[PDB]
């Protein structure tokens, strides 16, 4: 069991916003200069049902552009927002608002996208005991941001990276000897770390179990083999299933009762949520 | 017409790669210590047809991790890579390679994804005079990256941001005035006006706009517009367009089609790095 990302660190939210504003704004929003320099009002809708994620970023965009803009949130991160509902309201300067706009909803679109994908898969497997794990198949620079989205949507965090946990693969098993060696060396270095071994075989699974691993990733097992594995592993090691899984394969696998299902699809791809800022 | 992005500026590539390595690596890849401190070989394969994008990022990752890794590219940025073809070959240290892998893949799968979707749409409108344009609906921090992924795929760049061209939308909008004050402030920029109807289009033409964006027109009204605008202003059609509606719009003969889908969504190409 890994650390769960239940908030993105501020310094990471800040830097990501900063760089986002720059790439878009540079010397200045030239078209905003054509708008009356006054206060007004605005609000943001979804056009579709969604799991909100991105409050912190949107907030940070406001904060960096014009602390004068007041925001009120009608929904918070990790909530199911109904299609056509207002997520937040704005009161402030027209120019600032028109400038904040695209950046703000580019963060919500994305992260709510990620959260909403996750939630789908989760509802798909809500009847089974299985849980959803994410991966490192992330958008660069958005490792933590996406771990957070996935949590926001119902999913739990597989290891954050290469440092917090051990993941022993074919490539690793091949080198410095096989499985027993690998795990043993791995405990010797740091005994506090979770040791996971990926396998392609039931035989490799027995090894990793025999070597006293903490959890075992099943790479591309047949249904039947997953069944075998579960029997073998019950009470011994935690099991996580990997095999390019999507909304169309997850249920069959979840019916097996493996503890965990790894899914890169939930971070790898993005289905952005359709948003709109209504300014007036 | 607009600035086209045929290369991502070095520092952008550097800063991106640096932060993505940091976020993955931290104090260091602990699992790599189990692997032999030996030289080996590897290759990266695509498991589907695809347009390649992200060379600069893969290279730059190598450079930050271990300049002792040798890379050979069998396909370059903006080529069509066939399913199951190798993209590049590595000769180098097992540990450095195992550690570089995911960040490397994470870049190519993303940008080639963007270039690949873009290419699909282009092929769809292949038989018409219509050209594909992008938007500002990109991934935070990947503005230039994705303008480049789009160029790589056959698409063309709409303005880069809020600084390089005018875009008079409903909120700024009357029209005549707004255009006039724009050329005052800066006669040197493209003035674009987004319209919701044919009367506004008349206004924007009458005000000598550079290009005009049609927001959610019927086919019929798009037809009319085209007729009106021939030889006057360039037309661009925005209306939440996807692979399923682009052809109908292209048949109209409008100059440009605006698609946010090509960058706001991400369909990652499937990749694998076979080490050894």
Author numbering:
A (entry chain B): 7 to 286
B (entry chain A): 7 to 179, 184 to 286
Question: What text appears in the publication on this structure?
Answer:
Francisella tularensis, the causative agent of tularemia, is classified by the Centers for Disease Control and Prevention (CDC) as a category A select agent, and its role as a biological weapon is known to have been investigated in the United States, the former Soviet Union, and Japan. Here, we demonstrate how a combined computational and experimental approach based on metabolic network modeling, ligand- and structure-based drug design, physiological modeling, and whole bacterial cell-based assays successfully identified novel antimicrobial compounds in a highly abbreviated time period. Third, we carried out homology modeling and X-ray crystallography to determine the structures of the selected drug targets for subsequent ligand docking. methods, three proteins [3-deoxy-d-arabino-heptulosonate-7-phosphate synthase (aroG), nicotinate-nucleotide pyrophosphorylase (nadC), and d-sedoheptulose 7-phosphate isomerase (lpcA)] were readily crystallized, and their structure was determined using molecular replacement.
We constructed and expressed full-length or slightly shortened recombinant proteins for the remaining targets to optimize protein crystallization without removing any functionally important regions. Given computational and experimental limitations on the number of targets and compounds we could screen, we selected a diverse set of 10 candidate targets across a range of metabolic pathways. Our selected targets, as shown in Table 2, included the three enzymes we were able to crystallize (aroG, nadC, and lpcA), four protein homology model structures [shikimate kinase (aroK), pantetheine-phosphate adenylyltransferase (coaD), chorismate synthase (aroC), and 6,7-dimethyl-8-ribityllumazine synthase (ribH)], and three existing PDB crystal structures [enoyl-(acyl carrier protein) reductase (fabI), NAD synthetase (nadE), and 2-amino-4-hydroxy-6-hydroxymethyldihydropteridine pyrophosphokinase (folK)]. We mitigated these risks by considering multiple (ten) targets. This proved important because only inhibitors for roughly half the metabolic targets (four) affected bacterial growth in vivo.
